Paper text:
Connexins (Cxs) assemble as hexameric hemichannels (HCs) that reach the cellular surface and dock with their counterparts on the neighboring cells, forming the gap junction channels (GJCs) and coupling cells metabolically and electrically. Pancreatic Cx36 plays a crucial role in insulin secretion, whereas in the brain Cx36 is involved in neuronal synchronization. Dysregulation of Cx36 is associated with epilepsy, traumatic brain injury, and ischemia, and elevated gap junction coupling in these conditions contributes to neuronal death. Three antimalarial drugs, mefloquine, quinine, and quinidine, specifically inhibit the Cx36 channel.
Cx36 with and without the drugs (1 mM) was analyzed by cryo-EM, yielding four reconstructions: Cx36–mefloquine (Cx36–mfq), Cx36–quinine (Cx36–quin), Cx36–quinidine (Cx36–quid) and apo-Cx36, at 2.14 Å, 2.73 Å, 2.9 Å, and 2.49 Å resolution, respectively. The overall protein conformations are nearly identical, similar to the recently published Cx36 structure. The N-terminal gating helix (NTH) is unresolved in our reconstructions. It is possible that in the detergent environment, the NTH is too dynamic to be captured by cryo-EM.
Author numbering:
A (entry chain I), B (entry chain H), C (entry chain G), D (entry chain F), E (entry chain K), F (entry chain J): 19 to 102, 194 to 282
Write the structure that this text describes.
């Protein structure tokens, strides 16, 4: 069942890349232009949006995708250069991909949670005391967040299955 | 008629992909900017738009297209990996494509219906009690929705015809 | 004269595709942003624009182009599948392309006419009784409409010439 | 000197295509948004802009470029179809290119003149009597218009030289 | 040092093309939208911007790049036509490239100077007498202008070195 | 360990290029539109933004990437020209790339520091005395700046390792 595992992993990676590159940019285009705070203080919108969304979801997902693909690029470069042994490099890159995927999943959970609330309570300068701000299309962003989390979890499960197939004794050496 | 069925299925899939990728993004570009609610409450436009359109039609159709194409990608990857038995994989991927197409059709019907009304009655916080909001180019979006439903139905019919051609006794094994 | 007819048909199809894909999107970009109605009623602009232009000319032309190209795609896919009788398929696709072109020409005439008036009289809710709206760059859109109609007419004439060359006794059989 | 003439003609055609496709779209992007009329009448801006610029320069130049390239496409398609006499087709396409280029140059002169005035005097409904409107970046558009006229004139001269090289008694037959 | 000279010239040309195509468009995107004049007179912003920046730097640089590359295109086309003596054409195109680069450098100096002031004093109709206008991101544009001047100067020096290597007694013949 | 060093250097360079080209443009899109100063003075926003961000981070990073890749382009062009000794050119380009990377890292540190403050105190004409301005999404820009600094540091370390592998006595000769 290793071959089906590799096929599924490749398919899921391509699926995630396509979904991000196609829709993520459009979904988060007006994230700040349509972010409005109930206030008259100049600069409160900027500060409140920055506090609410320190890093946009799309940027985080793009960075995650590139980082997770990086070990594959390392392996491909090594293979290309070798021609004008590789099993150890393959095992190492599998381990690194596992670690990177797990770390990115955990970071996404700890940074964004599982939903984007429609209201934000912002109490940052220059806003006077505490103000209420309203997010743009929170439901679509929540769906995107949950779907990306599910896809990353599937990738993590497939990578863990591949690692188990490789076996502990074989990564120890 | 299996060959003409496959030809028609491929043609319809390419047609749907082209139509989406070419016009869908432009049609739904100003969905939120031109969405206006008869109110003075800050943040009511965002909440009302989010309630009216939890997921944009274009995003749902893009996701549907990628998901429906996924089994073909799995089959192609399996074929590539095999070279440096496949009939069972072909039957399985045909079944999965049929199921995915039917599911996406049903989901589209249950999520969007058959028309996009020009008026929306929004009663979500912070809007005071009940307010009236006005949708951008509802007729074009209704035409797009109906056309996509028809194309998906044609795809479902072709997939069912292919499944019937394969026969129950072959998919059972 | 069949060969020159085919060459002219191909050239005209390519020319129409190029013109649309290059200038239509830019011409019809600010169709709604620059559409203004003389009124204070919120949501009257959206309703009046939707009534005036149920389907943008550019979307209709893109759909027409893809649909009229569809029979050629069907023929190409059939030819590819055959290699690892075709005259009948060629005749059938010629007939279908002729019918599609004629239908799209008639639909364009019945749906848009021959000009885009600079003034529109809109009496749709929520607009109070009757209001006057002003279209964006009506002259350029009128020129585009007339030019597209002329190109479609040339395509129809070429298709009819090809059909006449083929002969009724051969389409019947 | 026919070889150098053909080389110069090809280079000039490519140069014009590159210049248009690279800068023309950006130069005319804000043609309507930055067009302002000294009035309070709703819809007067749209009418005055439409009267001042019935067809954008960029659209006209794109149409001209495609049309002048069309005879070359016809020749290439004829050559492709011939393989699985051509001198007459070459002469005919050269004559047609000459006629098209001359006609487009004359049309540009009669439609746009040689400069884009910074002020426009607009007396079209709904504008109250006569109003003054101000064009966006008129100097850049004037420079672009003059440069395009010069390039088209160079193309016309080269095509006329090629025709003279071919000779009257040879086009006649 | 003719080989290293040619390599450096090619690298510098590619570098300039890349820098322009990548950043120049973005740098000058909001040149007019962010250009503001201290006045209430309608149309004063357009007139003052047109006077301050008759031709955008990016358009001038694009035109310069294409024109400077034109002799190379002529040489390549001549070489292609020759196959189904060239030293003279090479010398001629070297001379023409040198002349074009020098002319464009001189024109840039005489047209834009070496800096973009943050304030512009505009006294063109309809502005009343004399008004003050404020330029968008003048420092970035000044840096871009100086950098482009330096790159063009390097290109001019390399071309002059190549010409000196060729020798006057060889260009004369 | 030279081999893993080269592979890592190539992978990191590709990673930086991808990250910039994919997200940097979008992160810094509304840098000036969302820049707001607490004042009524016309033209104060432009001056304050220009003072706060003389050169956008994205432009600096693009310039750095192209300049750092330039030595590789020189080496490739030299290799191509030689075919229809190279070790010295390889060593020279390695030294130049190391120097360029170090210089760009130092320049980035001196020009931008390590964070983008959310508040800016601007006292440039025409702003009256001293005004407060609010930056757009400062946290995301700070994260991007720190990440780019880390990547550049990794590149510098790898280049220094390669230089040490080559040794002093080889670069000296």
């Amino acid at each position: 069942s290793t071959m089906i595992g590799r096929i599924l992993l490749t398919v899921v990676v391509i699926f995630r890349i396509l979904i991000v590159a196609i829709v993520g940019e459009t979904v988060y285009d007006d994230e700040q232009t349509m972010f409005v705070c109930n206030t008259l203080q100049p600069g409160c919108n900027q500060a409140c949006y920055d506090r609410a969304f320190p890093i946009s979801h799309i940027r985080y997902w793009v960075f995650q995708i590139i980082m997770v693909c990086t070990p594959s690029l390392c392996f491909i470069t090594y293979s290309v250069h070798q021609s004008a042994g590789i099993s150890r490099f393959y095992i190492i890159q599998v381990v690194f991909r596992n670690a990177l995927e797990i770390g990115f999943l955990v970071g996404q959970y700890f940074l964004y949670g599982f939903s984007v609330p429609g209201l934000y309570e912002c109490n940052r300068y220059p806003c006077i005391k505490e103000v209420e701000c309203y997010v743009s299309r929170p439901t679509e962003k929540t769906v995107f967040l949950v779907f990306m989390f599910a896809v990353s979890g599937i990738c993590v499960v497939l990578n863990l299955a591949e690692l188990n197939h490789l076996g502990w004794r074989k990564i120890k050496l």
